[PDB]
């Protein structure tokens, strides 16, 4: 039906960090941190303390639902699984979708529907652009299973940048998503340019890993293991330089500006010492231009120490700067239209967030000011006409696009594997 | 069976001082002071006076059973064996378990069962967290031998802090056991955190040894040798300072407040003189924070005199404060949950008992008020939100947890050496 | 000059345990156990007994120089500072470099130079790969101060694995250092692969801490506090299993093979009892593969007891096996060359030492045989072609590389912070 959509059209975003979800009726979507928590090796002592309903399905997911079941850090680095490592779950990983299943299951269960006119939801999923074929097939399999439990009339999937352009309803610009895992820049002329869509393998999660290194170098290593901890630290102590080299010089001259103290929990309060105060810049900068002799040295000597198993989640080989990303995304649109499409740049998603702490504007920079000054370095003639803008409520964006897309996607259009578009029915 | 448990589930605690025991049916457990009494070198004169049944097994154990067989102090410091010196019996000591055997034998024999429906007990043992592997294997060997005498259907063992958390059924807090021998602090989130469990090697028995030194300095040394004597003295004359340095200053200014007279027996009545009246504080304080230039001097110069053999049971090297213990136990749980788990602090066990004698509240402090003020000194930001509580009937606690754990521990779960959990059958 | 180098080129290694040092002229370097001994709280009684020269600088360092100033164990666990806890001194610790200063000062003072042609030394320092930026800057500050005292023409610093590859002058292999604090595995093709260099945070010092636990479980705890004591015990009683599980099974079947008696001092002679005889394996094994349900249980229940302050120096979260370390270090070199570079494996450094005591070869294994059988478990196809070798004089190695590197490092090459290579001049 039609007005049936304005109620029961149900958007879902995944991305890496937060799974943003809700029906179209919401003003802004509810969030679930993507982490699933396994309950797997349990001393029968603790199984006595777990409700047999929760332990039955073998996981728990959601912000509040997991917090209650969290044991010590050793438990966290084991049984707390962040699937969607970057935008994507490796096929071979059974634990990867096992959480996504009950993460998606948690999503719908959160919103019951009393109305007997309810024929089942309309589930608009927004995956990352990097999502391969199997990740589509896998997640439709997920919602096919929830069809037996919940009422789902139809399921669709849209690439994440497609949502944002729909969310902004912007006519001419290059969308840039700050997605935690991946940065997806797409130009849009009258709509997405699928050929010009460019999605980096880098994201906010690379700002964690550059923080997760700092907290190891300060001797907080117990804190590093817990991903929530570096999150709070990164978000609080992370900072974006105007120009990295000029900034680090500044922070080594007058560190007292940059020394910060973050209270994670009453026991553990992270003090960024006087010396490393300049490393605050590497935290927020590595999202944008992770090519510098200053970072690429600091990341290299931080790749040496291998604590548990992982060598660290980050790439030593170097990536493309989001300045160079936007440019590369534009060379794929037509020279006719490039003057128009390169006018606006919409920054969106999480990793473009950073707010300059007050009084520090002479050195730090907002994500907006960063991109604008990033273009001046590479393509000067471009940065003249560029008006770069950050979305209001950056991370809520993709979901707002997911429902609008999900709202108008004529329901007689079947999902066909070849076109990778349209509804599928259970 | 099931309702069979609500009767014949049988909890046993050991700990150092009192072995707390009984079936689940009891309101509070019966106690046996852990002391075994050897009858070993007996002039045939006295063997004539001993029933040949008692002398046959070579020991006696229990409060009333030993009192009748106690000879002079020389006999007490010899043939009265306190096993479980701290939480643990050294493997090499045959006398150590030989008492525990007949101490555990005394425990079950105390409770005969008339009902022919009785298939044997369910013995839930609570050992100290410090109990090594052999101490588990040794005590199962004990109950395997009592299987031939008594009816024991199944035997299990739980670490002592696991009991308390079950006894309190507290969801978020850090348990602190005042166990006579050892202080075992564990955080609990939905249940014990085995990684965060921290057990000090210090306990109430270190408050004896600091009293046992005082009674030597007052010239009562005949009284010191008898462990029951310092017990009654410690419990009566022992006291817990608000702040040790401020307190000792007070007690040296106005000693008449603190001069006390304890009647042990009609012959021997201990008068804490006017001078040492300040040493009452070191008695109760050394349980909490045994690092002070005032104690660590007094314990050092009291380590010099070596009377019989032992140099004294106490550590000159210094230990961790229970304030620092709780903190160290929290750094092992996840920064996510630390805000919640650090809220409540449950004090339990014997060594957190002390009651301020009336009118003295301006200087002394209850164990509760002591811990709360202990945290303010170390981790100020923690002590703001901390609500610290003492268990009603502090020492009875562990047993109450031992039965509940012993009540539900599904009986098809075998004891497996690797997991160190579950029932074993004889 | 040139031939001036063949005399006055002066190598210095730090590492954790032994600081190996000497001029290039030596056959093998002289050693200094890294321990500094503070003289800090001294009763004026003892200051009368200390030469005012020694007490002036406030420390003493060196094997013989400290032995003479050692008081009781309480003094040792306080005023005997092992800096470089693992490979690294925490910035905030003033006591950390204060020893390194006079430790390095002790080093040069040991070797006076009579020749008036002597223009000052050439100091080649070998730090650990984990050495951060500040640890470089700190130690150059050290040698800048010794420039006023001694004659130092030039100072350089090389990462420790760089030395070994130079010391061996091996063309194709993966160096593995058994460094007391840390295990640094690097592949070398025509030289070090800085990207493939992988340095574990585990080392011989984790074999102490697993012995330091054993000596607490045997009741020698007075002996545990003294790091020299566990050293001699570890080196003597420590043993490396062929396969840990198969070995522990063997040692619990026939303990009389493994019961050992080590004479530390005429008073104290450590008898590893019959029972724990199997724990000899955990001593030497935890260097290699500290992931086992057998160790990771024994280390966990040994982390509970906290004696003085420290919870114990060791990581409960688990580390990477040196088998998996070598593999992870190879995935960073190019698939073209991996066939060649994975041929030889040079084991080096202290923690790869262990000699099977005679007649026990059926169960124990040399460090060589251990690594070779370690690879067979993980990467079978690799272990076929692998020829693994241990350096002759394992621990002397890094210094031998330090001088050769220090010998040819063209002196017109300045130290530049960015490249982290080359000479600096005072
Ligand atoms: N105030 C902030 N400053 C810096 N980074 C932030 C801030 N708030 C959120 N973030 C980052 O944004 C990320 C959220 O992005 P997200 O929408 O999950 O991307 P996607 O869902 O596409 O993977 C978080 O992982 C976090 O690291
Ligand atoms: N009123 C009191 N004041 C101070 N200490 C007390 C008091 N009552 C009991 N105690 C101490 O508590 C101890 C009992 O603790 P207990 O339960 O035996 O510990 P565990 O059993 O774990 O070893 C006794 O040794 C005694 O010293
Ligand atoms: N025979 C031996 N058996 C086992 N371990 C040994 C033996 N000899 C020395 N070791 C260990 O080797 C270590 C020396 O390594 P070292 O060269 O100090 O490493 P680094 O200097 O890189 O820190 C000592 O700490 C000791 O524990």
Residue numbers in the entry:
A (entry chain D), B (entry chain A), C (entry chain B): 5 to 430
From the article:
The similarity of eukaryotic actin to crenactin, a filament-forming protein from the crenarchaeon Pyrobaculum calidifontis supports the theory of a common origin of Crenarchaea and Eukaryotes. Attempts to trace back the origins of today's eukaryotic F-actin filaments led to the discovery of crenactin found in certain organisms of the order Thermoproteales within the phylum Crenarchaeota (Crenarchaea, part of the 'TACK' superphylum). Hence, it has been proposed that crenactin filaments share a common ancestor with F-actin. In Pyrobaculum calidifontis, crenactin is encoded within the arcade cluster of genes, together with four arcadins, and has been proposed to be part of a cell-shape maintenance system.
Here, we present the near-atomic resolution structure of double-stranded crenactin filaments at 3.8 Å by cryoEM, revealing their close relationship to F-actin. Crenactin forms right-handed, double-stranded, staggered filaments with a rise of 25.6 Å (half a subunits' length, hence staggered) between subunits and a twist of 198.1° (1-start, rotating between the two strands, equivalent to -161.9°). These values are very similar to the parameters of the eukaryotic F-actin filament, with a rise of 27.5 Å and a twist of 193.6° (equivalent to −166.4°). In our filament structure presented here, we observed a dramatic rearrangement of the hydrophobic plug, moving it upwards, towards subdomain IB, by as much as 21 Å. In this new position, the loop interacts extensively with subunits of the opposite strand, essentially the same function as the hydrophobic plug has in F-actin. In addition to the hydrophobic plug, a hydrophilic interaction between subdomain IIB on one strand and subdomain IA on the opposite strand helps to keep the double filament architecture stable. For longitudinal assembly, crenactin subunits within the same strand are held together via three main areas of interactions. Particularly significant is the well-conserved D-loop (DNase I binding loop) located within subdomain IB. Folded into a small alpha helix, it interacts with the previous subunit via a surface usually referred to as the 'hydrophobic groove' in actin. Furthermore, the ATPase active site is also highly conserved with key residues, such as the nucleophilic water activator Q164 (Q137 in actin), in the same place in both structures.
